[PDB]
Amino acid sequence: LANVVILATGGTIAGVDKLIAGVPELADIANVRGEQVMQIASESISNDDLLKLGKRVAELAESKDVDGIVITHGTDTLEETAFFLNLVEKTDKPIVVVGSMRPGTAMSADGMLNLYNAVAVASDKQSRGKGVLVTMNDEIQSGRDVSMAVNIKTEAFKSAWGPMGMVVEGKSYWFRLPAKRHTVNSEFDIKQISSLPQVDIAYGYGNVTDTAYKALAQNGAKALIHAGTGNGSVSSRVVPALQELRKNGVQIIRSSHVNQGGFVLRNAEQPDDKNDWVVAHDLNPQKARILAMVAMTKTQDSKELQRIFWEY
Amino acid sequence: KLANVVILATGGTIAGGVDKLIAGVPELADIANVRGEQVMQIASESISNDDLLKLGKRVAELAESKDVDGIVITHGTDTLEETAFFLNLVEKTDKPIVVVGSMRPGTAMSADGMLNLYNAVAVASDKQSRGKGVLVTMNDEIQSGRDVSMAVNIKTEAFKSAWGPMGMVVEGKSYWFRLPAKRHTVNSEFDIKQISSLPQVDIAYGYGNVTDTAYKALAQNGAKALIHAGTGNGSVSSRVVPALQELRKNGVQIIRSSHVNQGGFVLRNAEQPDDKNDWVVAHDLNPQKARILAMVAMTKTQDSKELQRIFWEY
Amino acid sequence: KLANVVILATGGTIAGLGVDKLIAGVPELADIANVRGEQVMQIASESISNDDLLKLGKRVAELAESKDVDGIVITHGTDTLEETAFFLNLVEKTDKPIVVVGSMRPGTAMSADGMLNLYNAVAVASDKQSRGKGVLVTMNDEIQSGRDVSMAVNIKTEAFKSAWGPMGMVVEGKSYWFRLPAKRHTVNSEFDIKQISSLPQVDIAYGYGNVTDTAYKALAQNGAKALIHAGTGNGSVSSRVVPALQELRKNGVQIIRSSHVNQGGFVLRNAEQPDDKNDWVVAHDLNPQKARILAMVAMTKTQDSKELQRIFWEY
Amino acid sequence: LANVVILATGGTIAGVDKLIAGVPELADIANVRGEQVMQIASESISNDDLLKLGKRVAELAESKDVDGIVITHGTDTLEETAFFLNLVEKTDKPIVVVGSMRPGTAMSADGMLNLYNAVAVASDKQSRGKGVLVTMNDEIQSGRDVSMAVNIKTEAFKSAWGPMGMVVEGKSYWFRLPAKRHTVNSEFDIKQISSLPQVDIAYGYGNVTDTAYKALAQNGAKALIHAGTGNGSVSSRVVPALQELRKNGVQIIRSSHVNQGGFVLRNAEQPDDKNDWVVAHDLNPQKARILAMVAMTKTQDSKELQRIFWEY
Numbered sequence A, D: 001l002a003n004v005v006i007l008a009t010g011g012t013i014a015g016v017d018k019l020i021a022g023v024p025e026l027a028d029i030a031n032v033r034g035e036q037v038m039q040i041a042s043e044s045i046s047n048d049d050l051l052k053l054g055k056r057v058a059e060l061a062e063s064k065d066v067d068g069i070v071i072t073h074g075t076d077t078l079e080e081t082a083f084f085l086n087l088v089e090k091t092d093k094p095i096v097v098v099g100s101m102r103p104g105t106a107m108s109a110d111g112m113l114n115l116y117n118a119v120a121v122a123s124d125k126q127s128r129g130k131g132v133l134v135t136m137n138d139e140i141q142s143g144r145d146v147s148m149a150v151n152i153k154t155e156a157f158k159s160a161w162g163p164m165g166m167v168v169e170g171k172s173y174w175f176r177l178p179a180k181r182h183t184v185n186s187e188f189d190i191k192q193i194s195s196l197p198q199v200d201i202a203y204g205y206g207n208v209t210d211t212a213y214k215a216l217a218q219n220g221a222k223a224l225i226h227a228g229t230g231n232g233s234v235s236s237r238v239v240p241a242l243q244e245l246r247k248n249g250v251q252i253i254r255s256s257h258v259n260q261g262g263f264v265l266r267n268a269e270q271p272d273d274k275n276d277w278v279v280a281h282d283l284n285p286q287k288a289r290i291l292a293m294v295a296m297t298k299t300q301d302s303k304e305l306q307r308i309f310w311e312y
Numbered sequence B: 001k002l003a004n005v006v007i008l009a010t011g012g013t014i015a016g017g018v019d020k021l022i023a024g025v026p027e028l029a030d031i032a033n034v035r036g037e038q039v040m041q042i043a044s045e046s047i048s049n050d051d052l053l054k055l056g057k058r059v060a061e062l063a064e065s066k067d068v069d070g071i072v073i074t075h076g077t078d079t080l081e082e083t084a085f086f087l088n089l090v091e092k093t094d095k096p097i098v099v100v101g102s103m104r105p106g107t108a109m110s111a112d113g114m115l116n117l118y119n120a121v122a123v124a125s126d127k128q129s130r131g132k133g134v135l136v137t138m139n140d141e142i143q144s145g146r147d148v149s150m151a152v153n154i155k156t157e158a159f160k161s162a163w164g165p166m167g168m169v170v171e172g173k174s175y176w177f178r179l180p181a182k183r184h185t186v187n188s189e190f191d192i193k194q195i196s197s198l199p200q201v202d203i204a205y206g207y208g209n210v211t212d213t214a215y216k217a218l219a220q221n222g223a224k225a226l227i228h229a230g231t232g233n234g235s236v237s238s239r240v241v242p243a244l245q246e247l248r249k250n251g252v253q254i255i256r257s258s259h260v261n262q263g264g265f266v267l268r269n270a271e272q273p274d275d276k277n278d279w280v281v282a283h284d285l286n287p288q289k290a291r292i293l294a295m296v297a298m299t300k301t302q303d304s305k306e307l308q309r310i311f312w313e314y
Numbered sequence C: 001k002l003a004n005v006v007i008l009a010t011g012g013t014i015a016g017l018g019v020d021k022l023i024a025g026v027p028e029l030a031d032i033a034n035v036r037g038e039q040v041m042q043i044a045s046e047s048i049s050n051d052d053l054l055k056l057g058k059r060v061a062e063l064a065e066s067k068d069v070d071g072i073v074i075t076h077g078t079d080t081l082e083e084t085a086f087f088l089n090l091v092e093k094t095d096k097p098i099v100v101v102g103s104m105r106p107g108t109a110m111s112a113d114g115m116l117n118l119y120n121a122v123a124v125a126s127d128k129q130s131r132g133k134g135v136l137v138t139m140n141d142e143i144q145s146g147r148d149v150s151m152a153v154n155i156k157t158e159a160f161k162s163a164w165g166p167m168g169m170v171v172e173g174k175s176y177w178f179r180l181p182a183k184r185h186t187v188n189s190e191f192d193i194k195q196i197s198s199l200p201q202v203d204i205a206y207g208y209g210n211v212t213d214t215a216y217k218a219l220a221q222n223g224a225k226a227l228i229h230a231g232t233g234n235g236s237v238s239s240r241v242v243p244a245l246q247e248l249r250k251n252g253v254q255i256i257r258s259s260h261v262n263q264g265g266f267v268l269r270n271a272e273q274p275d276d277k278n279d280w281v282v283a284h285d286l287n288p289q290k291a292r293i294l295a296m297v298a299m300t301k302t303q304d305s306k307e308l309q310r311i312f313w314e315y
């Protein structure tokens, strides 16, 4: 039986010793122990909190008493945390992040079976080397590109590229493998990362002005994620500010709020080569912010950052 | 005999000269009597509130003409969904209004704009379109202009609703499967005739480690309402809540939307105490649609309870 | 003052148990309705008969005619829930709410879906916004039309989908509507369970590579009055099958072209087959099992293929 | 430039030299020649057509001067041909199957760009080793589990497990890899198959009887795909007939007409171990028919068939 550690951080899914005893079936599939890393509403997570989790995961992944890791998380920023760990945890021990749409007290609460599934997946040989996984709604989803896409409903977490597998009666069924760099094959490592650069997001829409972009740069943004309309499109009213910001050294990364499929193509809506800007590829704005913040611990070259947005 | 449809051109990839747009689809003559006006020529990502008003006012003039049976607007994809929702709210006409764009220019291999334009004119000329509110006719679908959104990049199936298409248009014929449930057009309390300016409304994104910086800056630079594009069920970071309380007391409306746009909606009092803070939830409306509804609504009211009702009815 | 809701139990994984145990399992039902139960049958829905549908339809009609009933819930196996819901949508001439509900997991399983699905079914059945909307299905916090919801995803609780989207959602017992039905149903239907004592025999044959006329001929030989063709693509028919279907039509068997292309679009008349020349019918957007229900009900009234096609275009 | 061969089989997309003439941009990206292998409406395809195509593909894959192959195909059984090839073609040269939803004479016809993208993917080194691919609507879809899911519209082809990539301006962007056995790692080879076993499909629905199942076996079926309700469920009126056919040597494979996601679970709805039946896992009835025909060229052991249905 695999040794699995549950790291509790908070969220609608939640005292971690109670949490575990509340699912006695876990003892059947793994030797489980729990730790409370933090106790937060995930919409209120800070970069300090994400680093603390990254570090504690890394200490446990190096432990020989540890075969797999489950992180219980609020839904709101689950996808951010999952992508972060996918970039910085250089381990091929399974890492699973899991949450719930309903509290354990509610009628037909989803957390119990989610937590069982997460433990089952974290204890499975098939999970090794696959990168960070999310196990809600009987699905095995990639930590890279899974997002909270539907509110209220238990099927909240979706990817444009589909689920990789399913978990049913504690067994894993795989249909797809990841194509993007992660974990063991990442050039980033939480062991060398003690801090993260400031990165912020501004939204594009009808009649948008340069105000948010300038303010976020004035208050410390080292990169801005542009959550554009369409294919990362930028208002003629905002282009001149982004050019001035890039000249002051702020990276300009074009994402979009067009999140169900496709990607943002370099040089299509804007002259990225000429302006020395970066396209976020298929990554939504929150995900683009996590990859930018991790990438900028290593490089400030816009051409290297574009390679990173195309490989991870 | 044939319906009189006017095509109002605003720009976009579908035109990437209204007379050549129309010459480029000879078959339009089989299905309608068509004429074109260039209202403007823009990239829709650059659209302004003055452009919306100008368009809205032109549409209303044509809707009031006995020589106009239906109206097609050709438009860039990027903010098409915003224009369509705006018109659905302010045009008090049962006459069809159809908004249409394309994902490829007319010169591209397998360009989508010719059939999209034929289908928009067919829908604008069809009796079944009357009273339905504003429609968008891309990818053979009849989508509601209220809740269709550009949800897929690059592909021709770019426009999707959480509540499904209402119908399809094939070989110029409309096939209906659903009807609108929300207030629109003829049953709207809003009227472009009585709107001479729109209040400034801005949007700020919610994410891990977000600060109150954009919220304050946008308010300092004139926003009368802020659309919070929150994580999850419109959730607000405990770091930002005090700023949004101070802004609401300063008179700025706080509307909780989300970046969780494929289905569900934001529930009042669930993630934040809205009643206690005098905030509004945007229900199912994504941030850019919540901005349009806030802007139109605040031409008539600043009562947060009336705003909430309006977000539950439109 | 609470609404009177009756639960008609028929079996399924939601009861994996008497109706009295289903009601006892959700003690919060007492807060939103005066609930009563009746065990109509205890079956696996994959095993349902036409006699079971008729029986359930007549129980629904008597309860809908009762001044002491405000709404009706049917608990049902998932497998043919979509078939029961569409059948009731065609033959029940009541504006009273009729809700069909099931579960993917039994009540003793971890994170079982049944309790909340049954709470929400009763909530919707009790709500005045549900009146006049036709038969509803309330799973996964959704209000789905009984006309065109189908079991589309195995295992997961989001099993039930419509090509035309959910019509609303049910959250904390409250109903939130975003679309209305367009097609004819219930109070504006030309069909009535009160005038139906038997259902014509209707069967389904599948289209695929190398398919032959075998299944079509055997089903007609063993009494089918109509064959639903589950075609490839736009209800396409193999050149190896067309001759047999011409002969079956010539001999009185209606030929209805549906498809196994079930996530969107519909089957277009005269596009893949000359339906006018052949006197055949297209099933529009209806999947094969739904088309069989509509065909069955329609042929209680007409054997005229142009009336059948009008029906497939209006319901 | 890669040498790509286009094999025309018919369909709405379409003689092959006018097909190629129709897309003059093709010469820019590969050296293309056509052959007309057949001219059929794909709804009327036979087992002999599949074998003739599969053999012609295998000869071209062996040739030194062929870098990749495109098949132009009617949409109706495109998903059956694509899967068949994925199972029997032992090459890691790209094979791409492509059709169109509208004829080339129609307003906004999809066939020109679909044919361009197919040739582009067929000429890309990224396509080697990936299995058979389908390239419509700008997507790279797996031949294994892509299915005609939407009528009329150009987004007709979908997979429960999502697109593996996209093709844009002739360039391939990958996000997922296949997990199931295909082409070079398949235990099947078209070189050894002279004719396929007869396999038929019967539909499950309310008030279904054993008639179709009986008539198909009486007329030569060696396996029956049951297109069940739900999780491959079987009516109590049908089970006895299927026990009797299994006893007389006919394989019984439980598929479903629940085709948007999930799969059919062994022993859940029916006692497959006791009955010596097989479940089709996630494969839809027409795909499970292809796999049953191929598997049965090799084995008649139901435990080996179940293994095959779990690995392919």
Ligand SMILES: N[C@H](CCC(=O)O)C(=O)O
Pocket (backbone or CB within 6 Å): A010, A011, A012, A013, A040, A041, A042, A043, A073, A074, A075, A076, A077, A099, A100, A101, A102, B232, B235
């Ligand atoms: N406050 C939200 C609760 C959402 C959830 O976990 O369902 C969080 O921790 O993200």
Ligand SMILES: N[C@H](CCC(=O)O)C(=O)O
Pocket (backbone or CB within 6 Å): A230, A233, B011, B012, B013, B014, B042, B043, B044, B045, B075, B076, B077, B078, B079, B101, B102, B103, B104
């Ligand atoms: N610049 C974009 C082009 C997008 C399009 O129309 O496809 C616009 O006008 O919205």
Ligand SMILES: N[C@H](CCC(=O)O)C(=O)O
Pocket (backbone or CB within 6 Å): C011, C012, C013, C014, C043, C044, C045, C046, C076, C077, C078, C079, C080, C102, C103, C104, C105, D230, D233
């Ligand atoms: N035997 C199946 C059980 C499936 C379920 O209800 O989830 C039926 O009754 O339809």
Ligand SMILES: N[C@H](CCC(=O)O)C(=O)O
Pocket (backbone or CB within 6 Å): C233, C236, D010, D011, D012, D013, D040, D041, D042, D043, D073, D074, D075, D076, D077, D099, D100, D101, D102
């Ligand atoms: N009869 C169909 C035509 C449909 C199409 O290819 O779009 C075929 O050859 O499969």
